[PDB]
Amino acid sequence: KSPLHFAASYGRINTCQRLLQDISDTRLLNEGDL
Amino acid sequence: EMEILKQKYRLKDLTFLLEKQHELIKLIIQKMEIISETE
Amino acid sequence: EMEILKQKYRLKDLTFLLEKQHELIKLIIQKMEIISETE
Known about the structure:
The first copy, chain A, is an all-alpha fold. Helix content of chain A is about 45%, strand content about 0%. Chains B, C: Belongs to the transient receptor (TC 1.A.4) family.
């Protein structure tokens, strides 16, 4: 969550690929922060 | 007024350098090793 | 006009510092560990 919110906010795209290669898990993909 | 127009050009390239500088720092965070600080 | 000439010198060293700052950031990307972000 906080790994994905950090990696997407600063363009670390390979970190986002290793966080979203786990398919059929879409609760964290649209989860919002504070 | 010639002093102001010299200062405007000396500021116009300064903000051009800072924007060029800003994308470099954005690239540093984009490509950086983070293992100890991965929350 | 003395205020403008004080401000021009306070801007001339500011852009001198920023150019000195820019080569440091260029050195950071030049010498940086990149393993996770190697495309």
